[PDB]
């Protein structure tokens, strides 16, 4: 039943404004012509559809074709051209004449980018003839007779400017990323035919989905269904002959399938730059309670609690910069944020983004930040900012100030002609004095969090976090280790634990060797720690510590002229 | 259908010239013989798209009863053994044999590319055949050819030589008055409300040319139709009559239309509308008045300089320490100046290919000059204008050629088609001395660190859309916050808002927790004194003292 | 030949390669010798020219696919082996990268003996001394 599969205006959703604009533009000049003679002016007869892929442009066109009772003719982009000299223009002429004569009709030009690039960047011949013929067909003598032209593109900036003038393409509709309500609506339309268990909650699914657009939602649904099929095809055999009727019914793709598929899938934009999901949890990061709570506090509310921000009418805080001696756990905190927080993560290294060609670094940065704001809300981690943020003008001899142009590009991109809806930059630098002065400014990276060397209770917390899975001796107490280590870092405690594990594995494999010659060790013993902390050192010396404390106290001195401040 | 001289608007001088050229050698050949001059044979038309050139050609075709023959550039070629030559020959044969007709070829650039630039053999044949027939059509054969090209530089000069195409007509773009008559022409066939005053509408329509006015009118009509359709419950099955005579487009429709439209030239580089108003930038009032006066005076009071016979200053450069509303001022002018606005980020123009960069700079400056007046915002000038030096780290002086091209294409500014260059740099020392010329970025504005009253203005203007306590005084913070930049105050206020949100959500889920086992949704509907105290306990300074010292020295230089 | 195959026109270099391979397999069990592949198969990562990417992809496809080869062998020669995509340098495309270094003094003796096998000469001259003093020469 092709009628059942036919997609009406009900199918398309999440873009009701553009739907209304296109629906009126197509029907009102073909439903109330007397009204349009009464108003005095004629309606527009050219529209340009543009937006990222997987938003519903072709679906919108299909809905228009199904609903409107007028003739509908479709032209794919590259289809017109042919090897023999001068047939493409013949194709356009025959298409237009047949479309116009055979009742009032709707033209749709799919992927116009293949036809009209710029009229001056191309170097062929036939293409310039096709664009000139198209211009003539759009406007001239008897330009159009009760016909309107729709075009679809993903990169409207590669279009001839002559096409974007009134008379050729009058109105440009922007079908962008759906909102939370929009994604909820698309989820509802795409899940109206499959069988759901009562437990499913589409509102939560729309809540944790942050950048999925259209086909992304469809993919999520499809993969979830496939997972349910791979959950109920495990109890039943292959049964190549046929499927029994008791199992085909009562399938019921439950909510955990949706949770699993959402935890696996990523937005269609981000899959190019997807990073492996390193497994970390908040209990893994010991100590630094105020830092973790502050991070969670500033990241989870603007994305989940926008009503209060609208109520107060202030934008949220965007930037954050960790700085301190190496190994204190800033990168570890970044790992925790990347793995647990619901917002999207873009992990980029410091000098990874540079490039050989001229200006391509700036293009790469523009691409990354445009990608980040496209699938917003997103959090971007800039590790080792001192690689990218150099003090401008210090390098007389350089590659043409490429570093200077890079840092200036970053400055303008993080604060410029941008709506700045939801972008969170995290900074992590082990040399925070060499960073550019403007980057530390509020409004770009306002929160400078110092991660000092852990205290004894913080070293104890770190140790408890680092042994949360290893089997341990019942009579073993970490309090002595904490009381004995003072200047160590988290990496140093990890080193001590690894050494203890090394001695434990050595004893285990030796004992197994004698056993086979003719599980002795159930867990790590006291003596493995007694012999594992004799090769312990302090990672950061007193010079680096004195530098970082001098920096912190210089900031605290800059914190002057503060008091009780009674109101 | 029925288009005549009444339809055409603007370009009266060009209209008179074309009228003479097309009527006199066709209705009075005897007078041409009597005076003793052979009438011209060919006229080309060029200019930006949508300037009514094709409309004018149709009006000339209709008004004059002479036989007409339309040919379109890309429509003369064929497949059967190069029948394009035969096509043009038969076109000329029909044009001569039928009557003393008139021949009009549109978009000649499609059928006349430069010889070296086009590679192939059929193109050579068609261009040469066009040349020979255009030569052979003698003067006494009473026919004239009208050429209409969107781009004049796409034709080889051989077609432009005297005796084949001698008369040029630069239609260009209309002035404010031309826009006024174009509006009047377009609106003389619809029901206009009484309150419409087209003079104002032409005072604010700036970059619109020829056809964009029609788009504005039609879309405004649409706005009225939708405003009146939903209220009347116009069912898809029914037809309304009593509403029909009452539909009238109001002024608010046109305000909406102007706020939501864009000149077609600027359609590529349109930026999404971000609201900023002159009341949000509390401080720097003297800069606000100076900028508004200097940018508006050439646009509203031209006569003063004409009587003085002087060229008012055009360029200006903002410099100062980070975060003092420079980009905010750019946004404010972009929103509330009543002129076009094109901002470009520094590094966008550079590229790896050879030459395209400067070509893009030419494209942006051509676009800026075409839809004049405009305001070009150069943010982060520390990326383009760099001390050349003998460092030799450039890629064959690629930065050097780019900056030199920018200097050559920005220094050739004319008093006509005024384009105002806005500069904005963080570190003023690394810009080249060539940017301080009187004819190039003359004005040097310094954005200083704010004072106590300026800081109070910053706070009160920044929290306008913010619920507050009734009994709260902001003088204390001003007295305390001394070297604090505006961005730092934004940090303070955002932190206070964050603490308010923390308290609100805490009370919320608390009350809910006792609920499960309407009232005031927010027991803290506004920030409070202790929230501000706790936000201010952890505040920091933005700019250090070394930057202040070096900027003070730089200011002290002049 | 190395640079002969590449053509500015679209879809000709790969056309030449396809024609060569099909005729080679058609006629009889034969040996191909693509000399200076480095001018035909540069690093896909570091290249910008579309035609080189096209030719290297075509070579990869034809050399290995669905029933790619049937009793045919191919030989490659380069002056440097590093500037080639790794996908060519695995088993099934170029199995073993055999080296051929500068000839030894012994090799000088054999090459001189080969050269002088048909040229009449004085008896006094000795080949071993000539080879010893000809150090550094090649082929």
């Amino acid at each position: 039943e092709n009628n059942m599969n036919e997609v009406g205006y009900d199918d398309i959703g999440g873009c009701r404004k553009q739907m209304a604009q296109i629906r009126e533009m197509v029907e009102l000049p073909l439903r109330h012509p007397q009204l349009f003679k009464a108003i005095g002016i004629k309606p527009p007869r050219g529209v340009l559809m543009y937006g990222p892929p997987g938003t519903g442009k072709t679906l919108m066109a299909r809905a228009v074709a199904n609903e409107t009772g007028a003739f509908f003719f479709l032209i794919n982009g590259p289809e017109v051209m042919s090897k023999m000299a001068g047939e493409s223009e013949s194709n356009l002429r025959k298409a237009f004449e047949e479309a116009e004569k055979n009742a009032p009709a709707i033209i749709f030009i799919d992927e116009i980018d293949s036809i009209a690039p710029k009229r001056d960047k191309t170097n062929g011949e036939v293409e310039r003839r096709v664009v000139s013929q198209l211009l003539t067909l759009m406007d001239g003598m008897k330009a159009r007779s009760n016909v309107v032209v729709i075009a679809a593109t993903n990169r409207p900036n590669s279009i001839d400017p002559a096409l974007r003038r009134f008379g050729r393409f009058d109105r440009e509709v922007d079908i962008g990323i759906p909102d939370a309500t929009g994604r909820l609506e698309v989820l509802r339309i795409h899940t109206k035919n499959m069988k759901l268990a009562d437990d499913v909650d589409l509102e939560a699914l729309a809540a944790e989905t942050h950048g999925y657009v259209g086909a992304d939602i469809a993919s999520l649904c499809s993969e979830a269904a496939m997972q349910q099929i791979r959950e109920k095809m495990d109890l039943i055999d292959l049964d190549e002959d046929e499927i029994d009727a008791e199992v085909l019914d009562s399938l019921g793709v439950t909510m955990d399938n949706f949770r699993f598929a959402l935890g696996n899938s990523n937005p269609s934009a981000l899959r190019e730059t997807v990073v492996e999901s390193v497994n970390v949890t908040w209990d893994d990061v010991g100590g630094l309670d105020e830092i973790k709570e502050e991070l969670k506090e500033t990241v989870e509310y603007p994305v989940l609690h926008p009503d209060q921000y609208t109520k107060f009418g202030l934008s949220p805080s965007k930037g954050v910069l960790f700085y301190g001696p190496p190994g204190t756990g800033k990168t570890l905190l970044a790992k925790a944020v990347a793995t647990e927080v619901s917002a999207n993560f873009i992990s980029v290294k410091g000098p990874e983004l540079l490039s050989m060609w001229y200006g391509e670094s700036e293009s790469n940065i523009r691409d990354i930040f445009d990608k980040a704001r496209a699938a917003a809300p997103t959090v971007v981690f800039l590790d080792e900012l001192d690689s990218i943020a150099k003090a401008r003008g210090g390098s007389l001899g350089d590659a043409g100030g490429a570093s200077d142009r890079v840092v200036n590009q970053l400055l303008t991109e993080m604060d410029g002609m941008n709506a700045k809806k939801n972008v969170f930059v995290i900074g992590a630098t082990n040399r925070p004095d060499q960073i550019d002065p403007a980057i530390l400014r509020p409004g770009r990276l306002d929160q400078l969090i110092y991660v000092p060397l852990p205290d004894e209770n913080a070293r104890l917390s770190i140790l408890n976090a680092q042994l949360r899975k290893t089997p341990l001796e019942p009579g073993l107490e970490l309090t002595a280790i904490a009381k004995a280590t003072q200047g160590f870092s988290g990496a140093d405690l990890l080193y001590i634990v690894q050494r203890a594990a090394k001695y434990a594995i050595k004893d285990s494999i030796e004992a197994h060797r004698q056993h086979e010659a003719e599980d002795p060790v159930p867990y790590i013993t006291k003596e493995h720690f007694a012999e594992a902390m004799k090769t312990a050192k302090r990672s950061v010396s007193d010079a680096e510590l004195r530098r970082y404390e001098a920096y912190s106290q210089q900031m605290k001195a800059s914190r002057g002229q503060f008091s009780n401040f009674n109101f | 259908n029925e288009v005549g001289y009444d339809d055409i608007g603007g370009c009266r001088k060009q209209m008179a010239q074309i009228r003479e050229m097309v009527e006199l050698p066709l209705r009075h050949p005897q007078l041409f013989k009597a005076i003793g001059i052979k009438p011209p044979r060919g006229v080309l038309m060029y200019g930006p798209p949508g300037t009514g050139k094709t409309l004018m050609a149709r009006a000339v075709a209709n008004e004059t009863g002479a036989f007409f023959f339309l040919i379109n550039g890309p429509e003369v070629m064929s497949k059967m053994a190069g029948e394009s030559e035969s096509n043009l020959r038969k076109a000329f044969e029909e044009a001569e044999k039928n009557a003393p007709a008139i021949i009009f070829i549109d978009e000649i650039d499609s059928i006349a590319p430069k010889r070296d630039k086009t590679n192939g053999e059929v193109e050579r044949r068609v261009v040469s055949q066009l040349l020979t027939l255009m030569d052979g059509m003698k003067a006494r054969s009473n026919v004239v050819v009208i050429a209409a090209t969107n781009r004049p530089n796409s034709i080889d000069p051989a077609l432009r030589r005297f005796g084949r195409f001698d008369r040029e007509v630069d239609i260009g773009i209309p002035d404010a008055t031309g826009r006024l008559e174009v509006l009047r022409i377009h609106t003389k066939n619809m029901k206009l409300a009484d309150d419409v005053d087209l003079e104002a509408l032409a005072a604010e329509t700036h970059g619109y040319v020829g056809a964009d006015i029609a788009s504005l009118c039609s879309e405004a009509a649409m706005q009225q139709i939708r405003e009146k359709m939903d209220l009347i419950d116009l069912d898809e099955d029914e037809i309304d009559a009593e509403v029909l005579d009452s539909l009238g487009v109001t002024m608010d429709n046109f305000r909406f239309a102007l706020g939501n439209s864009n000149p077609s030239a600027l359609r590529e580089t349109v930026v999404e509308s971000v609201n900023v108003t002159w009341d949000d930038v509390g401080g720097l009032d003297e800069i606000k008045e100076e900028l508004k006066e200097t940018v508006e005076y050439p646009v509203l009071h031209p006569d003063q300089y004409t009587k003085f016979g002087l060229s008012p200053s055009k360029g200006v450069l903002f410099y100062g320490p980070p975060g003092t509303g420079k980009t905010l001022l750019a946004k404010a002018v972009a929103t509330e100046v009543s002129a076009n606005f094109i901002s470009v980020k520094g590094p966008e123009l550079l590229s790896m290919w050879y030459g395209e960069s400067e070509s893009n700079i030419r494209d942006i400056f051509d676009k800026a000059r075409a839809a004049a007046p405009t305001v070009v915002f150069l943010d982060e000038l520390d990326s383009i204008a760099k001390a050349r030096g003998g460092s030799l780290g450039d890629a064959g002086g690629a930065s050097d050629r780019v900056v030199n091209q920018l200097l050559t294409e920005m220094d050739g500014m004319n008093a006509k088609k005024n384009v105002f260059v806005i500069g904005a740099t963080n570190r003023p020392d690394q810009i080249d001395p060539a940017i301080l010329r009187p004819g190039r970025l003359d004005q040097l504005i310094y954005v200083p660190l704010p004072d106590e009253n300026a800081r109070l203005s910053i706070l009160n203007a920044q929290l306008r859309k913010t619920p507050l306590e009734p009994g709260l005084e902001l003088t204390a913070i001003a007295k305390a916050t001394q070297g604090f930049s505006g961005a730092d105050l934004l940090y303070i206020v955002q932190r206070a808002a964050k603490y308010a949100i923390k308290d609100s959500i805490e009370a919320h889920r608390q009350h809910e927790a006792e609920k499960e086992v309407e009232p005031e949704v927010d027991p803290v509907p506004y920030i409070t004194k202790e929230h501000f105290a706790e936000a201010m306990k952890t505040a920091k300074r933005s700019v250090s003292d070394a930057e202040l010292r070096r900027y003070e020295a730089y200011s002290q230089q002049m | 030949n190395g640079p002969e195959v590449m053509s500015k026109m679209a879809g000709e270099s790969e056309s030449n390669l396809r024609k060569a391979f099909e005729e080679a397999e058609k006629n009889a069990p034969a040996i191909i010798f693509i000399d200076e592949i480095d001018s035909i198969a540069p690093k896909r990562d570091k290249t910008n020219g579309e035609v080189e990417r096209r030719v290297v992809s075509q070579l990869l496809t034809l050399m290995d696919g669905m029933k790619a080869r049937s009793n045919v062998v191919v030989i490659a020669a380069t002056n440097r082996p590093n500037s080639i995509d790794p996908a060519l340098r695995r088993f099934g495309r170029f199995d073993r990268e055999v080296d051929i270094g500068i000839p030894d003094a012994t090799g000088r003796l054999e090459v001189l003996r080969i050269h002088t096998k048909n040229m009449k000469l004085a008896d006094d001259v000795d080949l071993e001394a000539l080879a010893a003093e000809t150090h550094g020469y090649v082929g």
């Binding site: 170097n123 060609w357 001899g397 590659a399 | 059967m80 790896m352 290919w353 | 500015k8 020219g49």
Partner: peptide
């Protein structure tokens, strides 16, 4: 009949170098 043909040959790119001021 006489056929047409499309052709796109090449372009020119720009590299960037680093220097040391010893």
């Amino acid at each position: 009949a006489a056929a047409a043909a499309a052709a796109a040959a090449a372009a020119a790119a720009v590299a960037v170098a680093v220097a040391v001021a010893a």
